[PDB]
UniProtKB/Swiss-Prot annotation:
<keyword id="KW-0702">S-nitrosylation</keyword>
<dbReference type="GO" id="GO:0045740">
    <property type="term" value="P:positive regulation of DNA replication"/>
</dbReference>
<dbReference type="GO" id="GO:0032298">
    <property type="term" value="P:positive regulation of DNA-templated DNA replication initiation"/>
</dbReference>
<keyword id="KW-0479">Metal-binding</keyword>
<dbReference type="Pfam" id="PF00069">
    <property type="entry name" value="Pkinase"/>
</dbReference>
<dbReference type="GO" id="GO:0000082">
    <property type="term" value="P:G1/S transition of mitotic cell cycle"/>
</dbReference>
<feature type="binding site">
    <location>
        <begin position="125"/>
        <end position="128"/>
    </location>
    <ligand>
        <name>ATP</name>
    </ligand>
</feature>
<dbReference type="GO" id="GO:0007099">
    <property type="term" value="P:centriole replication"/>
</dbReference>
<feature type="modified residue" description="N6-acetyllysine">
    <location>
        <position position="6"/>
    </location>
</feature>
<feature type="binding site">
    <location>
        <position position="141"/>
    </location>
    <ligand>
        <name>ATP</name>
    </ligand>
</feature>
<keyword id="KW-0460">Magnesium</keyword>
<dbReference type="GO" id="GO:0005829">
    <property type="term" value="C:cytosol"/>
</dbReference>
<dbReference type="GO" id="GO:0006260">
    <property type="term" value="P:DNA replication"/>
</dbReference>
<feature type="site" description="CDK7 binding">
    <location>
        <position position="162"/>
    </location>
</feature>
<dbReference type="GO" id="GO:0051321">
    <property type="term" value="P:meiotic cell cycle"/>
</dbReference>
<comment type="function">
    <text>Serine/threonine-protein kinase involved in the control of the cell cycle; essential for meiosis, but dispensable for mitosis. Phosphorylates CABLES1, CTNNB1, CDK2AP2, ERCC6, NBN, USP37, p53/TP53, NPM1, CDK7, RB1, BRCA2, MYC, NPAT, EZH2. Triggers duplication of centrosomes and DNA.</text>
</comment>
<dbReference type="GO" id="GO:0006338">
    <property type="term" value="P:chromatin remodeling"/>
</dbReference>
Amino acid sequence: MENFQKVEKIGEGTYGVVYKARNKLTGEVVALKKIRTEGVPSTAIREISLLKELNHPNIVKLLDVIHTENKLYLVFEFLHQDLKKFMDASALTGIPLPLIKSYLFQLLQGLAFCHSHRVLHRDLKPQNLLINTEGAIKLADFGLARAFGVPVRTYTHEVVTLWYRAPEILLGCKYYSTAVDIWSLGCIFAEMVTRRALFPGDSEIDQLFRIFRTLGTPDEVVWPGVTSMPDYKPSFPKWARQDFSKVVPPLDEDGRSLLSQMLHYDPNKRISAKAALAHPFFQDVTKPVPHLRL
Ligand SMILES: Nc1nc(Nc2ccccc2)nc(-c2cc(Cl)ccc2O)n1
């Protein structure tokens, strides 16, 4: 748009490309996300518009929702680096535990906030998490999947990230709950710790089986109703659960304990963001300053 003297394309999200842009007028630097056709649903514009009211220190502010030329643009406050990039840049030394802990605590605060407002993210991933020089981390792009509905293959054909998808989604559950975000966050937490994606599935079944190989194939004991899930197949191989200390070494028992609660198979047993905030793991949480190279 002419209102912006655009800076550049900075990434591609599940629902569209994100641009860094300068509001010529105000000179404001923002993140502009172009939503991907029919002509842009009306129910969606209303629902996404409601997200403009979301105000929380750990939620990237949605400044505007612009509908034009049969195209939807979301204008977001701009943060300089996404967690994926930070993790790649910190892959040699790892993110200090205090920072990982700070980030997780803040992320849980953001989710607790959104969930308490009946807003789910549904597609949480490192690239959706933005950090700034002052130690804050924020979640961006909530409520998009619930407003537009999950795609399948971007217009530009880009490898959709399945790594953070909760098993109930993989098993074809038509109804999502706040639990899917906790699962995604658990996966991200594990990744910050180990510096490697926890469940880097190549496909939907590989994603599911990687989960099964690590957490054990779920059954009716650990997850009542799982054998009735839409995509559940009795033919699924039955893997025994792996010793959990093997999953995120060298994370201490508090962290491993919290993580195990975030990764419970049953969305109903999975810890809530609010409950997670009270976990002993955060007893000594602080807010460290990240070494950010912008
Ligand atoms: N620094 C920075 N990088 C990126 N990269 C990125 C974008 C899309 C996919 C993957 C990475 N995205 C943002 C960003 C994104 C949104 Cl939604 C809202 C505000 C933002 O500041 N910011």
